[PDB]
């Protein structure tokens, strides 16, 4: 057992996680003071969902760059990793704003969103899957360190087409190893079972991220405005 200088690594991620968690109140301002002439009432729900999400992906990119090893990669690969992890990492962010009691997700505009909120904006389909994830995560009692380390393991997931996959692979091993160190040294029973359960969450992300892409296709069919930034990053056209 025993955590080494992963301890420093963990403080850093737990710090930056905290730091890049909420969008600047000025940006959240811009969003509210944007309501059109008598907003569709179900639009001041949908616009919030898609506008604020631009902020979310940005914050994700913000955090991804302060991660040790990200600079050791070529721009080509940096950009690939970023796009690939965005929708998956997004789910960890949402999960952390989940209110077990009110079964909602407290947006950065202090507005609690529920199955209704999303259904009203026209996202009733996926809403349940999202809520379920939030619930399953809350049930695991995933803490900050685990959350951060986990999101970092996702960001460094060697996908095909990356130019130097072997390098992203090696960098990720460091966070994987620090998560093991951390989980084991909480010298709690079940350690291996907890570690394995944490990692599995990553498989769940592949379906959630797929779902997100699926949701984009549909908004594109129903012809509803998907912020260009999001189309550009998730390759939604």
């Amino acid at each position: 057992p025993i955590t080494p200088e992963q301890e420093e690594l963990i403080h850093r991620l737990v710090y930056f996680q905290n730091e890049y968690e909420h969008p600047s109140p000025e940006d959240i301002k811009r969003i509210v003071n944007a309501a059109p002439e008598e907003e569709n009432v179900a639009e001041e729900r949908f616009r919030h969902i898609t506008e604020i999400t631009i902020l979310t992906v940005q914050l994700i990119v913000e955090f991804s760059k302060r991660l040790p090893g990200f600079d050791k990669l070529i721009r080509e690969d940096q950009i690939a990793l970023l796009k690939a992890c965005s929708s998956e990492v997004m789910m960890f962010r949402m999960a952390r704003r989940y209110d077990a009691e009110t079964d909602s997700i407290l947006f950065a505009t202090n507005q609690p969103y529920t199955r209704e909120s999303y259904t009203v904006a026209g996202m009733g389909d996926t809403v349940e899957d999202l809520l379920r994830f939030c619930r399953h995560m809350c049930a695991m009692k995933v803490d900050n360190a685990e959350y951060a380390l986990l999101t970092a393991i996702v960001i460094f997931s060697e996908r095909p087409s990356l130019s130097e996959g072997w390098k992203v692979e090696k960098i990720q091993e460091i966070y994987i190893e620090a998560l093991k160190a951390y989980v084991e040294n909480r010298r709690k029973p079940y350690a291996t079972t907890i570690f394995a359960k944490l990692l599995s969450v990553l498989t769940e992300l592949r379906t959630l991220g797929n779902m997100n892409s699926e949701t984009c296709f549909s908004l594109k069919l129903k012809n509803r405005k998907v912020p260009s930034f999001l189309e550009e990053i998730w390759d939604v056209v």
Binding site: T192, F195, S200, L202, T203, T207
Partner: protein, 193 residues
């Protein structure tokens, strides 16, 4: 019977028979057994023929011999996944020299999925998945002691496998099957045999 057809026929027969023999599987409610298989179906078949084709060069093997090559992955029924299977599973499998014990373990973690849709005995199925985690962790530790990351390394091909699974807009080899029933009717009757 066709060449690829009987391969598909055997491939499923082997799957269902594999699961029938996983400790405790058949002690679950039959309906849950169908659910678990109907849902784990693609990822299970994929992981299986993926590992079995580690030695095969530029291809996927299926139910002995019958090494499908890219030039007819579409015929075979692995058209949507062929490329990624070789690079994200076959290659990575070979690279780490993932053995049969490990494979079976991961496949079981896949079969014993509590988030399976409509699964009734979720709590049970979960305890079962958790045993495999323990067994597999200890197995690596005992077998490959000088590889501190192997356990997680093996565990992390599960997402990769998932992704390849989502690319299948159907249950692999199902329409090549001789009978013409519903997935559930096929599973259910194949289970009782």
């Amino acid at each position: 019977v066709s060449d690829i057809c009987q391969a598909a026929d055997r491939q499923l027969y082997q799957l269902i028979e594999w699961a029938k023999h996983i400790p405790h599987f058949t002690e679950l409610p039959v309906e849950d057994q169908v659910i678990l298989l109907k849902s784990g179906w693609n990822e299970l078949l994929i992981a299986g023929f993926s590992h079995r084709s580690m030695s095969v060069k530029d291809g996927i093997m299926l139910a002995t011999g019958l090494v499908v090559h890219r030039n007819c992955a579409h015929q075979a029924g692995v058209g949507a996944i062929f490329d990624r299977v070789l690079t994200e599973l076959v290659a990575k499998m070979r690279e780490m020299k993932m053995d049969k014990t490990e494979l079976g373990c991961l496949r079981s973690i896949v079969l014993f999925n509590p988030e399976a849709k409509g699964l009734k005995s979720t709590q049970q199925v979960e305890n079962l998945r958790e045993k495999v985690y323990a067994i597999l962790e200890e197995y690596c530790r005992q077998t490959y002691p000088d590889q501190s990351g192997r356990f997680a390394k093996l565990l992390l091909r599960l997402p990769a496998l998932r992704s390849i699974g989502l690319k299948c807009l159907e249950h692999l080899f199902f329409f090549k099957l001789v009978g013409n029933t519903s997935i559930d009717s096929f599973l259910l009757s194949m289970l009782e045999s």
